[PDB]
Amino acid sequence: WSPYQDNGGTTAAIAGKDFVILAGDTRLNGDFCLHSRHDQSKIFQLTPYTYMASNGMQADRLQLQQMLKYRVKWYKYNNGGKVPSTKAIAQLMSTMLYHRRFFPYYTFNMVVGLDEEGHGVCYSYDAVGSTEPFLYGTRGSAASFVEPLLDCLINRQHMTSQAPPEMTKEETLAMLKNAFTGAAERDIYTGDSVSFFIITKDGVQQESFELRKD
Amino acid sequence: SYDRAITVFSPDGHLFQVEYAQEAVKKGLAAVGVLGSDSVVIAVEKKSAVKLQDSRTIRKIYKVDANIYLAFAGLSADARVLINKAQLECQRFSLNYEDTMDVDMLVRYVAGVQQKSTQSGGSRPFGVATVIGGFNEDGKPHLWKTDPSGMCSAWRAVAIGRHDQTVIEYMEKSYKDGMSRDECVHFAIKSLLEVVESGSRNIELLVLQYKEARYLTEEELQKFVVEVEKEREEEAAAKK
Amino acid sequence: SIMAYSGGSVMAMAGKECFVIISDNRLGEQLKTISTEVPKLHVVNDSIVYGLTGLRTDQQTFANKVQFRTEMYKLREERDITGKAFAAMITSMLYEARFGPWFVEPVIGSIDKSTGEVYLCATDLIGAPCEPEDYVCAGTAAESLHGMCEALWRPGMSPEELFEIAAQAMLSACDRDSLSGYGAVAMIVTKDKVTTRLIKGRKD
Amino acid sequence: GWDRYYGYQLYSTEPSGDYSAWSAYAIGQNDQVAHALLKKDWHESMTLEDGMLLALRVLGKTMDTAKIDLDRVEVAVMRKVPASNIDQLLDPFKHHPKTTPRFQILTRSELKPHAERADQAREAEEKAEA
Amino acid sequence: MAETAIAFRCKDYVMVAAAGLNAFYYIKITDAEDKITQLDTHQLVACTGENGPRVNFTEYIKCNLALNRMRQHGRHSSCESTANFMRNCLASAIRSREGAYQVNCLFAGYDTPVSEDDDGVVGPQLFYMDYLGTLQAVPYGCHGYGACFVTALLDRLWRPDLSQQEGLELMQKCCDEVKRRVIISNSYFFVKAVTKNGVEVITAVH
Amino acid sequence: MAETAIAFRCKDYVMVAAAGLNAFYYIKITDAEDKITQLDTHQLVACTGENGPRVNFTEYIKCNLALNRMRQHGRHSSCESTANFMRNCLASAIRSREGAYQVNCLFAGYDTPVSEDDDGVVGPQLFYMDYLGTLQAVPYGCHGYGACFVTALLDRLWRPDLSQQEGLELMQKCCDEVKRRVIISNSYFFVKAVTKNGVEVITAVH
Amino acid sequence: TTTLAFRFNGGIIVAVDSRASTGQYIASQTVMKVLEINDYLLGTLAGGAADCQYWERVLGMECRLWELRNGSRITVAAASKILANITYAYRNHGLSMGTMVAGWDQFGPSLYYVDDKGSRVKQDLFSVGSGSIYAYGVLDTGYRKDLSVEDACDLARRSIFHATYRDGASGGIVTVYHVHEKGWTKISRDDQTKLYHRYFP
Amino acid sequence: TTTLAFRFNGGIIVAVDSRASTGQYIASQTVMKVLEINDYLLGTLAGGAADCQYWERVLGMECRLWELRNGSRITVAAASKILANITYAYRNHGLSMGTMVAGWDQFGPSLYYVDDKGSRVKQDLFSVGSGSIYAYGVLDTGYRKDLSVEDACDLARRSIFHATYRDGASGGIVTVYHVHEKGWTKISRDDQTKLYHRYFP
Ligand SMILES: Cc1nc(C)c(C(=O)Nc2ccc(F)c(-c3nc4ncc(-c5ncccc5C)cn4n3)c2)o1
């Protein structure tokens, strides 16, 4: 018996000027079977402006989502109802991944939220909490498909051409569908349906999208 | 274990076990220290010339650090336990920080131990008051004073022990700021023989300089007492 | 192995009204000589002399705990420790640390001052008591000493002729062992006197 | 006891944690009396036979007894004897000192030559009283 | 073991020498790092090993000798009392949680009479030690890779009646042999000496 | 790997340098052993490795170049034909009974026109090799522990138009860096050079 | 990682890359490998990414608590001894971190170096990381104590570059700092690919 | 086993011990560490006792068959190359032997050394075995090329002795040979215990 197990799936996020698009496919799978196709336990809401979006092991995912859930509640009780920012949550994430360094979580995390200025910033983590603010991020089994793809079309590097204007919410969303329709073709542990979260200052809207079932 | 609350409050907001620990210091031997420009002197009472005491001369002012020395007043058994906590703290400091300990750091530790015994179960306060003097790594002479309540404060001329207020109100109207070395030893003698009897074998004075500490012997102390004894005759002649 | 790290062999024989004890002079680290003038014997009183072999770090640490316990025995009980009480004392010390065991093998020789009975004892590293009436031996050359001591011993020996057998048994066994040698230091002891002799050996 | 740091030492111990070094001291009944009698005659360059005769003579003063009795007096001396248990052969690189200190307690055969010198010294200061 | 320590005692001095090399698996960090820690005014120790346990063992030994001089009114303890305090820290660490100190050291000192009643040792002291807790008083001791080159050199040339200059040119032969056969580049050797007037840092032999 | 080989080619010469250290696990056997084998009058190879396979590989290569000059009437083959014959012996030995050669080598040479119909290479040749059978023509190649110290040194200072003296003082900087950072004592470096007049043993840089 | 730093007549210059690779995959390219401890200290990063960012944030907490209690700045001889006692305490716990501290205390400059095993050394010239062996040969050739401020910034920026060019675990954006008596200033911040067409046009 | 041989102005002096130990038990004390190959060559033995005595008996057969076919003596450069090609052929077969060949051919002397892995080196000064590291430091201190015949016999007998005194795997009876132009002569054969009361009376 081994107490670690990879449950597939991928999560990707692209942050804009006053928004973040956050996505993650709904597909749970085990040893060689397919457990489910409708797991919503991959992206978790902490505050109305900051989400966490983790994947890897499904059992240690649900435990990390709850300990993150109540450290926000002790923050809210001890500060007079003040909701924590993205920078406060993502440093809370970076410490708790190191407090369990010798029996760690088999999760790979992304804290996704808005700034105090309103701009969206995504963070990424290893298994022990190496953080960095960055404009996008892709974790999971299909990370090596999508993270070079997001390098080629967001940074606009190695292309002798002038810069396009700033990406809207719609042109970011239609871009991010081209990655999950690309990861459903070439990765066997990825893709039944991907759920898009659009975090704006006037609440969050939620969409769904269909991928290949095989 | 036994941890019943001993140091409690009075119906007038006083701590009885602290006010009664200060009374044990007011019967202790008087110790006077003044602050100069390049030197620190501290003089203690050194109970008597017992003639039965050992010919090996016993120091009253104890060494705590290389540059920080300490003199106390109160119960001599409580003060020995207090200093072996402070002598253990200097070797905790230069094992975790690779530095010589400042004078203001050691006094905040000893005052932290005095206050910690005033808020424990089964513990009475320490019945000692200390005068701590020493230099930093950059010169800067210092002189400190802790009470049994645990309050640290740095002074320009300090006196503890029996007749606490008697010396301090005397040497706040005769203190000259920025003395030399020979003026400090002369000023510590004339403040200490105000309280102790006129004997010459019951003063133990010490001069602190930078990386050089010199205890005064028998015959060197005879030179400074006579210069004080001839001047206090002039001070009485100035009154009449 | 850890037991043959430092080198050194200690043995003892029993005579009529006397016993001998003899160690070598070598200290080492598995092939190389660290010192050439180091005995392994220890004397606690005028009746008991014991020798330690094994790991030299444990040869000094255990002998400090023995001297801590032998001198505390003389303060509590107003008397010198006897041979049967000393051998049963450090038998118990090697059994308390049975899972973290000391790497010593004490070779105890003792005698009664008033009666004249010799008492030999050689425990293992885990404290196994064993009292032969003829001889005891421990160390790296211990397998060579059971041949030398058993083919040369007889029960009725004088103190002068028991030394001659124990000395030729130590040296002939250390000429076949490459972790023991460099002379030998012996100690014959009767009811009346203690004589300590240093013996010529090969400097190889 | 003797150490190599300051030689022969003598200490008191109070039931409060306080101690003090001394050259002569008294604890028990009439310790305030026996301090003054030791203060009247103690000098630096004093031998052990002059110190043991000082020790027995002040002991008879407090319990007001001429002809000091040996059944009611216990003595013990702390001096250095020549070292006998030196074993240079099993310790080749260890140095042994020449003389070692030995705490001992005198018997009745050892204290009778010293108790008959303290009453005579009391008798020597008795013929010159009037 | 890559760095050697060489020490020999004579009639009125103890020479020590320790190569000041510090490396990172093949990369020379330093060439002049002092590895002979001055414990007391008449005592020093030449520890070898990696730089992790070597500082943390010597600072624990040095601050406890100084603490035992604070609590004992500035009375300097003997060299055997310091050496037996050292191997107590080696022997209690091989049976502990944190593990054994990987330090090999040579203790050196000179015994002076602290008072007129002291009739102890007058001569010099030199103690071989180990990482396990072995302690041995020895005429000369050596650690490192080049130890076996120079221990048999001191079998040939060491004499108990060597002078300050004759033992100074012996240590120069001790340093030139390690430069000749050992593949590890030991170029600067930090020669110090303990005499009746304290320690002294010899500039000539390097 | 304990011994370094440094080689760089320029407009009309190829410098080589190989430390002449031979050791037995920490004991310096030699300090002057020639490790740059003169294969032909215009070709040489600077092999590194232990002394077992290093002689037996170079003697097999050298005696077969000489045999191919016996059977072909003294006609000297090109430097690429020798280098491709060498890596055939490395690559066929990693899949054999006796095992792989543990030799790392730098081939060097100068191409001269053997007749009037030869219109091949005129310039110098320098080939990096490996123990597996990797072959790469390179502007400068380095082996050993100190290779990474000096390959980034030649990233800084090497120029294609260096002269005989300017590349001679560059190789002196190459030898002084290995003495400065590598713990392995490389003191004598055997600098040779291949020019249009054959090989030459440079005495100055050591 | 190819962090280096050296000490000269005029202060201390710290120079890093910005690349974090988890083997043969490059995780990131904008990693800050200098955690400024406060406005007069610096700390560097090599080895494990989480082991460095945790304990130099612990080190930045013990330096701030020093100034609150004692009212004065912490020295660098006390700052590394905090980091070395932490590191030696966890030497059997498999940590991987190699960090330099650099700062201007009241005794001038000092450039220390702490292992993951409790070592602390005091020199004027270091280069740490997997590609540091490339950064020594170009730095030891051109180092001298009395360099100017501009030439030592040029020697540091050029010595990072020749190791980023050769090591697979090094590269990105070369960041050069300068520790003078008033604190530290970020000198330059430039890409390694842009820096290739300056040094070899 | 401690075994050395050196080259000087006057020939080659070979000096050995005579001890064979199986770990901590000493098997024998009269082992001839020098196998004379013929009346102008020598060969020493170190490492495995059977691996040396076999292949230096094979080497003594290939040197005798050389003289039968070619009518002349074999050189030392051909004699070691026979032993080195044998040794390199069995480098994966776990052999343990380290041997020096020494002799006077028509080109003066030459002193070689063959591993168990196929190496062959040409120097003037060797010391092989487990206790060789003790025999270097007393020999490198007192070696020079123009020693006399008696002093170089004294330096070899004294350098073996300080290795037998310190190493547990070396000892016995120090055997000193001398290779001059007419062949070899057994100089001395003396016990190590008798040799202690000569050098330290
Ligand atoms: C004074 C001094 N002189 C030198 C030469 C040094 C030094 O090098 N000290 C040092 C200490 C601890 C470390 F942990 C490291 C260190 N740095 C690294 N950088 C990158 C990778 C790595 N990265 C990606 C993939 C794979 C690997 C192996 C690994 N390490 N390990 C370096 O110190």
Ligand SMILES: Cc1nc(C)c(C(=O)Nc2ccc(F)c(-c3nc4ncc(-c5ncccc5C)cn4n3)c2)o1
């Ligand atoms: C040019 C040169 N420089 C040096 C320093 C050498 C050298 O040392 N070459 C060498 C080669 C092959 C060997 F096999 C040996 C060799 N000698 C030995 N003697 C004794 C024991 C032994 N004995 C008893 C018990 C246990 C052991 C391990 C083992 N060995 N192994 C030595 O060559």
Ligand SMILES: *[B]([O])([O])[C]([C][C]([C])[C])[N]C(=O)[C]([C]C1=[C][C]=[C][C]=[C]1)[N]C(=O)C1=[C]N=[C][C]=N1
């Ligand atoms: B430098 O290259 O060492 C750099 C270190 C810096 C960010 C503190 N990063 C890395 O290369 C390390 C390599 C490594 C060393 C030791 C163990 C494991 C990895 N990479 C990371 O730590 C890493 C891995 N994945 C994500 C983020 N960081």
Ligand SMILES: *[B]([O])([O])[C]([C][C]([C])[C])[N]C(=O)[C]([C]C1=[C][C]=[C][C]=[C]1)[N]C(=O)C1=[C]N=[C][C]=N1
């Ligand atoms: B000397 O110690 O190297 C000696 C030289 C030999 C020519 C007599 N060798 C031995 O003593 C070896 C030691 C050894 C080395 C390597 C592997 C195993 C053993 N011993 C023997 O070969 C041996 C075994 N049994 C009897 C006699 N000799």
